[PDB]
Amino acid sequence: KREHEREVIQKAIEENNNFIKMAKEKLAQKMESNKENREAHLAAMLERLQEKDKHAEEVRKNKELKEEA
Amino acid sequence: MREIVHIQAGQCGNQIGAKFWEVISDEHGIDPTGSYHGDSDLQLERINVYYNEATGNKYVPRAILVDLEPGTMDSVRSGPFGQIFRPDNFVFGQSGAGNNWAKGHYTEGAELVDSVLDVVRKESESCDCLQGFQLTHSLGGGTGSGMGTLLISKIREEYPDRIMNTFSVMPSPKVSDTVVEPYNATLSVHQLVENTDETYCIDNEALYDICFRTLKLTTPTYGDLNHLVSATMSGVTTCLRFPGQLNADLRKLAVNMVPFPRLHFFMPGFAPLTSRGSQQYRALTVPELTQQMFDSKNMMAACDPRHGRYLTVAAIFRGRMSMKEVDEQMLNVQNKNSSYFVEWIPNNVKTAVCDIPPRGLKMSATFIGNSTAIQELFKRISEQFTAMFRRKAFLHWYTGEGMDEMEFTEAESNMNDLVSEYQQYQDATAD
Amino acid sequence: MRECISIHVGQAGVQIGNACWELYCLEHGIQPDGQMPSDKTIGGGDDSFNTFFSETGAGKHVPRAVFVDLEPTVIDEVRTGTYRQLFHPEQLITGKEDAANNYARGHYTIGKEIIDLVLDRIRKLADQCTGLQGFLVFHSFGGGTGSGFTSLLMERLSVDYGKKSKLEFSIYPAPQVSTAVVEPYNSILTTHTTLEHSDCAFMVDNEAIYDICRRNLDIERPTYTNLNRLISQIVSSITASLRFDGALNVDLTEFQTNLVPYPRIHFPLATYAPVISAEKAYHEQLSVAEITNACFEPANQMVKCDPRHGKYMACCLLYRGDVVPKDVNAAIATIKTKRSIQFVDWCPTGFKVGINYQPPTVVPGGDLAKVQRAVCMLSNTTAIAEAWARLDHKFDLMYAKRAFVHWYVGEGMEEGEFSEAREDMAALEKDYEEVGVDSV
Numbered sequence: 001k002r003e004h005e006r007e008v009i010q011k012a013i014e015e016n017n018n019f020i021k022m023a024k025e026k027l028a029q030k031m032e033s034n035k036e037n038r039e040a041h042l043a044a045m046l047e048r049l050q051e052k053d054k055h056a057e058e059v060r061k062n063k064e065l066k067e068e069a
Numbered sequence: 070m071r072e073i074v075h076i077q078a079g080q081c082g083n084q085i086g087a088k089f090w091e092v093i094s095d096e097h098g099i100d101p102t103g104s105y106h107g108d109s110d111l112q113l114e115r116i117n118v119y120y121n122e123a124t125g126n127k128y129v130p131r132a133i134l135v136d137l138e139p140g141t142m143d144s145v146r147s148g149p150f151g152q153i154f155r156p157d158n159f160v161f162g163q164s165g166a167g168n169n170w171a172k173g174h175y176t177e178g179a180e181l182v183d184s185v186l187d188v189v190r191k192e193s194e195s196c197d198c199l200q201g202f203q204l205t206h207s208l209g210g211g212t213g214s215g216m217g218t219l220l221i222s223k224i225r226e227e228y229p230d231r232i233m234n235t236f237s238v239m240p241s242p243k244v245s246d247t248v249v250e251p252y253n254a255t256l257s258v259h260q261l262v263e264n265t266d267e268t269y270c271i272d273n274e275a276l277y278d279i280c281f282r283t284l285k286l287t288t289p290t291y292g293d294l295n296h297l298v299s300a301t302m303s304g305v306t307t308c309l310r311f312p313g314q315l316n317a318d319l320r321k322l323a324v325n326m327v328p329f330p331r332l333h334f335f336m337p338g339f340a341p342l343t344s345r346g347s348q349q350y351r352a353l354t355v356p357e358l359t360q361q362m363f364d365s366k367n368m369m370a371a372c373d374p375r376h377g378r379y380l381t382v383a384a385i386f387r388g389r390m391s392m393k394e395v396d397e398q399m400l401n402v403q404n405k406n407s408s409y410f411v412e413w414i415p416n417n418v419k420t421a422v423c424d425i426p427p428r429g430l431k432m433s434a435t436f437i438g439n440s441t442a443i444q445e446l447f448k449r450i451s452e453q454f455t456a457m458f459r460r461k462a463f464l465h466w467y468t469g470e471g472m473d474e475m476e477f478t479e480a481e482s483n484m485n486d487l488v489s490e491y492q493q494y495q496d497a498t499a500d
Numbered sequence: 501m502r503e504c505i506s507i508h509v510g511q512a513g514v515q516i517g518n519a520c521w522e523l524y525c526l527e528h529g530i531q532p533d534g535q536m537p538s539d540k541t542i543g544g545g546d547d548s549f550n551t552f553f554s555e556t557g558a559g560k561h562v563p564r565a566v567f568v569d570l571e572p573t574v575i576d577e578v579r580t581g582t583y584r585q586l587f588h589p590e591q592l593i594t595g596k597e598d599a600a601n602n603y604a605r606g607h608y609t610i611g612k613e614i615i616d617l618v619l620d621r622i623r624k625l626a627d628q629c630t631g632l633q634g635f636l637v638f639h640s641f642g643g644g645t646g647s648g649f650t651s652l653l654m655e656r657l658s659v660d661y662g663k664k665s666k667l668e669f670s671i672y673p674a675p676q677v678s679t680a681v682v683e684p685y686n687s688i689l690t691t692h693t694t695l696e697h698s699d700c701a702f703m704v705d706n707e708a709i710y711d712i713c714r715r716n717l718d719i720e721r722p723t724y725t726n727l728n729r730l731i732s733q734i735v736s737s738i739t740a741s742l743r744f745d746g747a748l749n750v751d752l753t754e755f756q757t758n759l760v761p762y763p764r765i766h767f768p769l770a771t772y773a774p775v776i777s778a779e780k781a782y783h784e785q786l787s788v789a790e791i792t793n794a795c796f797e798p799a800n801q802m803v804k805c806d807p808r809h810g811k812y813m814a815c816c817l818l819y820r821g822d823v824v825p826k827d828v829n830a831a832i833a834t835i836k837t838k839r840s841i842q843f844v845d846w847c848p849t850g851f852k853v854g855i856n857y858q859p860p861t862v863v864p865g866g867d868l869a870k871v872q873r874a875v876c877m878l879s880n881t882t883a884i885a886e887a888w889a890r891l892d893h894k895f896d897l898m899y900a901k902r903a904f905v906h907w908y909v910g911e912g913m914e915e916g917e918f919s920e921a922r923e924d925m926a927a928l929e930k931d932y933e934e935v936g937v938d939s940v
């Protein structure tokens with residue numbers, strides 16, 4: 001009976017520690033996944049704006065080619 | 070404080086921008102010299118949203134004036150509230166835009182944009198917590214349309230997580246006979262679909278009709294048209310400037326008003342609208358005020374909401390009135406017209422109330438609609454665009470600046486796609 | 501010993517917290533400066549009210565509370581209001597930019613910048629407790645902070661305090677006073693994320709409170725102030741077992757044993773009486789029988805639903821004021837004969853009763869009449885799932901078109917989180933059906 005009593009309380013400790021551990025890991029995974037996602041969305045936005053700037057340089061460059069002719 | 074930085078570009082942008090600052094200055098008790106002389110603490114509670122506070126308790130509009138010619142801004146500086154603006158916030162060239170979107174966006178405007186960003190950056194660095202920006206401009210000219218959209222994307226690059234808001238004046242042959250306005254407008258809409266979070270569509274077509282049909286002004290001037298614009302701009306910014314629970318900042322308004330990123334073009338409306346000659350036999354009632362703000366005749370965009378469906382709506386009532394009655398009448402108009410509100414966005418109409426009425430009125434109602442009927446406006450522009458582009462008329466103005474026909478075709482398709490998308494959600498059903 | 505730490509999150513949580521702590525001070529005789537002349541033990545003690553108030557050596561009685569909001573304007577009114585001396589400055593925590601009615605900003609983009617400071621402040625409160633019992637978390641379902649930041653905080657509290665009990669007072673959205681179209685999204689997201697971290701949650705349907713104010717108090721257009729005064733009375737009834745001592749007093753945790761038969765089935769339905777104006781209460785003494793019968797009037801429930809269309813798994817009566825068991829027993833006998841209260845077949849049918857003798861109190865300038873006796877019924881009925889069903893239906897209408905979803909994805913969330921949360925809600929609705937079916 002003493003052996004069973006020890007197993008019960010160790011079981012209670014283990015499941016509480018495992019709940020904490022699971023919750024900590026899930027939150028770390030979600031916050032990392034969220035950070036990467038938001039950063040990727042911003043990166044795509046800025047990359048589209050940069051392509052516009054590139055296109056702008058091409059337009060001004062194209063005006064010189066026809067003004068020299 | 071949640072600061073907004075205001076930019077006005079080109080003739081139309083500076084004209085309507087100046088009136089906006091005159092009107093809200095009067096509402097907040099700020100005189101032309103920047104001193105406060107109001108009589109209500111509600112005027113100053115959120116004053117920092119639009120004004121800086123300098124030495125001597127002066128209030129300076131957080132506003133930047135941009136143009137490629139000095140003419141309009143010189144008259145603004147000489148206007149009533151001209152001395153209120155920060156002198157170092159006037160940025161202007163000399164060459165002008167000549168009503169050419171390419172010169173404003175790629176040529177002359179690109180030469181000046183960096184000096185504009187230097188001023189924007191200075192205003193943003195002295196902000197406790199910058200919300201975002203609001204731009205006033207026309208789409209039919211060269212500077213506001215071309216350089217305005219350029220400023221939008223350059224600011225977007227440096228403040229990618231801030232809210233970008235514009236008041237865009239749509240061209241109409243009833244007001245201006247400049248032939249290339251459909252070109253400039255379509256090219257501008259191309260940029261606005263991608264780079265702004267919310268756009269108030271100020272339609273010169275609707276402003277003229279209101280002045281001529283409703284206000285009975287046979288010869289409407291730009292001053293007449295700007296009275297409607299300034300009254301509309303005061304109304305749609307009320308929730309940002311006074312203590313309020315609903316849509317109290319640019320981002321919460323966008324989250325409430327924009328269910329799909331590209332469909333961020335709003336139809337503004339105002340009530341009451343009455344001519345000086347019409348006698349008001351009885352004070353306006355809440356039911357009449359509510360019914361009037363939902364009528365096509367009171368819309369600042371030449372679109373009939375009964376030709377489409379509402380995705381979202383923001384209403385703002387100003388003045389002393391029964392909130393119980395406002396609630397009942399807003400429920401009534403939604404129940405009586407349920408067919409015109411999409412069923413798959415429940416509770417899509419939100420109502421704000423501010424105790425402080427506009428100048429001269431005891432009560433007013435301001436309307437902000439995200440209606441699929443806005444496609445009528447874009448259809449009008451697309452029809453004028455293709456009538457000129459299918460002949461390739463006047464393209465040398467733009468190709469001479471470096472552009473090619475491909476960019477015209479892409480802007481045309483993007484605007485035509487925007488119309489198809491409005492129709493898509495108009496026809497969508499819950500079942 | 502047995503201390504309880506209250507956490508008020510977002511505008512709704514903070515403003516309801518204002519009303520609750522003002523009411524507590526009036527019930528206990530604590531002045532706006534924190535002094536309590538009747539408390540003869542200076543700087544400490546183990547009195548029942550010490551579960552909610554610590555004490556300084558200077559005689560100040562300080563709420564065991566943290567206020568948190570992602571913008572400052574609401575908490576700023578506390579910092580400058582009537583009870584500003586009640587709280588230490590570090591108990592009131594604000595950011596600059598709020599969650600903009602976006603769960604993703606409250607849980608991630610904005611919330612992550614302040615979550616560590618919030619936890620450090622909660623730890624300072626916990627360190628002063630000799631036997632911390634748990635947390636009480638007040639928040640809206642619909643706001644970006646109330647939904648997103650609350651769920652982040654609840655996850656972090658499970659990690660930092662293990663299975664230490666966490667109870668919620670959650671404000672369920674109503675169109676009459678709602679401020680965001682996406683409140684159904686935020687509600688499902690936070691309910692899913694918080695479900696395994698909450699031991700017990702009392703939902704307060706703003707539409708039920710709104711109707712009660714209009715119907716029973718003759719308030720034409722109730723404001724947040726009207727609503728929060730009533731909510732505070734219900735909160736006070738529920739926590740009174742923790743703050744007052746009495747022979748007939750029954751601890752909230754003992755009611756909890758009966759109220760929660762399975763971990764997920766932890767949403768009691770609260771009903772409160774009497775709600776009456778001073779003009780109607782004048783010369784009209786409402787007896788134990790009268791306020792008890794009102795508990796089973798659906799119009800007096802804190803959540804709109806029809807218990808007659810579900811099954812009971814528990815019924816608890818929390819009385820306060822001039823009430824003795826004899827009158828309770830007689831009142832219950834009457835109800836047991838005129839209302840068919842149907843229990844599931846696997847649950848005992850006896851009502852659980854507690855009595856706190858301290859009479860109810862009212863805040864000056866309020867709408868509720870002062871009464872000699874009041875009661876809050878806490879029942880576990882399958883009918884409360886009606887509230888989930890209404891929310892889930894609004895969610896489904898919008899999500900089928902992905903309306904507004906880009907606002908959440910833009911802040912880093914994935915569509916998979918929406919379907920995962922919605923599936924958990926569907927399973928929860930199914931759980932509530934299952935527990936009501938009779939045993940084989």
Ligand SMILES: Nc1nc2c(ncn2[C@@H]2O[C@H](COP(=O)(O)OP(=O)(O)OP(=O)(O)O)[C@@H](O)[C@H]2O)c(=O)[nH]1
Nearest residue numbers: 510511512515598599600601640643644645646677
């Ligand atoms: N009963 C009650 N409900 C409130 C109160 N304040 C806000 N609400 C409700 O809460 C919901 C909105 O959430 P809020 O608490 O205002 O938002 P928040 O938590 O501050 O989050 P964000 O402002 O988006 O950062 C709406 O359903 C409101 O009706 C209040 O003081 N009392």
Ligand SMILES: Nc1nc2c(ncn2[C@@H]2O[C@H](COP(=O)(O)OP(=O)(O)O)[C@@H](O)[C@H]2O)c(=O)[nH]1
Nearest residue numbers: 079080081084207209210211212213240245291
């Ligand atoms: N409502 C209004 N519209 C204007 C005003 N000024 C110009 N517009 C319109 O704007 C278009 C011309 O653009 P404009 O602003 O003059 O070009 P820009 O100065 O190069 O940016 C035309 O369609 C005009 O009708 C004004 O003060 N009010």
Ligand SMILES: Cc1cccc(C(=O)N2CCC(C(N)=O)CC2)c1
Nearest residue numbers: 761762763764765930931932934935
């Ligand atoms: C973690 C855990 C462990 C045991 C039970 C639950 C639980 O809440 N239910 C809901 C009720 C359902 C039923 N009896 O039909 C069974 C599962 C959760």
Ligand SMILES: Cc1cccc(C(=O)N2CCC(C(N)=O)CC2)c1
Nearest residue numbers: 748750817825829850851852853854
């Ligand atoms: C009938 C009887 C006889 C003797 C003692 C009691 C009694 O004080 N309680 C406490 C309250 C409990 C309850 N159901 O709330 C029932 C037992 C009741």
Ligand SMILES: [Ca+2]
Nearest residue numbers: 539541544545
């Ligand atoms: Ca003491």
Ligand SMILES: [Ca+2]
Nearest residue numbers: 927930931934
């Ligand atoms: Ca199940």
Ligand SMILES: [Mg+2]
Nearest residue numbers: 080081168210
């Ligand atoms: Mg011009």
Ligand SMILES: [Mg+2]
Nearest residue numbers: 510511598643
């Ligand atoms: Mg808030």
